[PDB]
């Protein structure tokens, strides 16, 4: 029933607004004034002007900035997943497995909302770190962000809004082919109805773009690959890199990821 799918779409958009303080609409409104970090000197100036708390090399520091952002993103995503009808019924083991494999895919999806072709909103939109600077970084740090920027440029061309993204994100979380799932049957059934809600959502909200649903689902596999390539580049520098020690939440997520 179309109306039951419009009621699922509305519930997810309402929960998405409640779960994610920096939405794409606010991000677009800003990107169209945050402190611009574009080189070494503007970075050092930036973190005194500007979302990092602890007891106390630039590449490592920026990396710990992103880690800190991740940990809070997982918390928003977890609070959002819990509102997806039927998620809090799945085998608690499988809730954990969906979270585990879904959380970075959502992070990069929502990171695209904060990106344009030249940089990214940081620290809830009070900063803007340039793509060039991120690329200029040394060793393998200059390659962390670049695939995200390339994904975001293509993904942002779809012109999804937050109401679109609320269902797309939910579709991603409820993937039935995550390694180690116990009960894939009720997960696929939840996902199947989210996909119907997404499809109706895209035909109502984007009547003019044919095959947007098709283009969107192909992006889902892009996201999986981005995370897989990040997993490895993370395991690359856990050998050379002496100064990095991943946040506990993140080393738990990454543990036997890929």
């Amino acid at each position: 029933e179309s109306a039951d799918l419009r009621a699922l779409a509305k519930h997810l958009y309402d929960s998405y607004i409640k779960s994610f303080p920096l939405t794409k609409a606010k991000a677009r409104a800003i990107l169209t004034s945050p402190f611009v970090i574009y080189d070494m000197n503007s970075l050092m100036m930036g973190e005194d002007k500007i979302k990092h708390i602890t007891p106390l090399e630039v590449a490592i520091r920026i990396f710990q900035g992103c880690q800190f952002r991740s940990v809070e993103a997982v918390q928003e995503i977890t609070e959002y997943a819990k509102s997806i009808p039927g998620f809090v019924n799945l085998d608690l083991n499988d809730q954990v497995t969906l979270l585990k494999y879904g959380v970075h895919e959502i992070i990069y999806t929502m990171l695209a909302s904060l990106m344009n072709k030249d940089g990214v909103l940081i620290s809830e939109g009070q900063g803007f770190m340039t793509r060039e600077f991120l690329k200029s970084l040394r060793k393998p740090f200059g390659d962390f962000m670049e695939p995200k920027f390339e994904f975001a440029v293509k993904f942002n061309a779809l012109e999804l809004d937050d109401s679109d993204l609320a269902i797309f994100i939910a579709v991603i979380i409820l993937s039935g082919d995550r390694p180690g799932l116990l009960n894939v049957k009720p997960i696929e059934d939840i996902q199947d109805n989210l996909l119907q809600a997404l499809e109706l959502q895209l035909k109502l909200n984007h009547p003019e773009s044919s095959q947007l649903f098709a283009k969107l689902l192909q992006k889902m596999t892009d996201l999986r690959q981005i995370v897989t390539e990040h997993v490895q580049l993370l395991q690359v520098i856990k050998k050379t890199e002496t100064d990095m020690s991943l946040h506990p939440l993140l080393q738990e997520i990454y543990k036997d990821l890929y």
């Binding site: 997982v74 918390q75 977890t78 609070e79 819990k82 608690l92 083991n93 809730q95 954990v96 497995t97 979270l99 585990k100 180690g180 116990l182 506990p248 939440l249 738990e252 997520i253 543990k255």
Partner: peptide, 14 residues
């Protein structure tokens, strides 16, 4: 799964 991932479980708990 649930054995490992205590941090995930506790975010899911409430």
């Amino acid at each position: 799964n649930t054995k490992n991932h205590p941090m995930l479980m506790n975010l899911l708990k409430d």
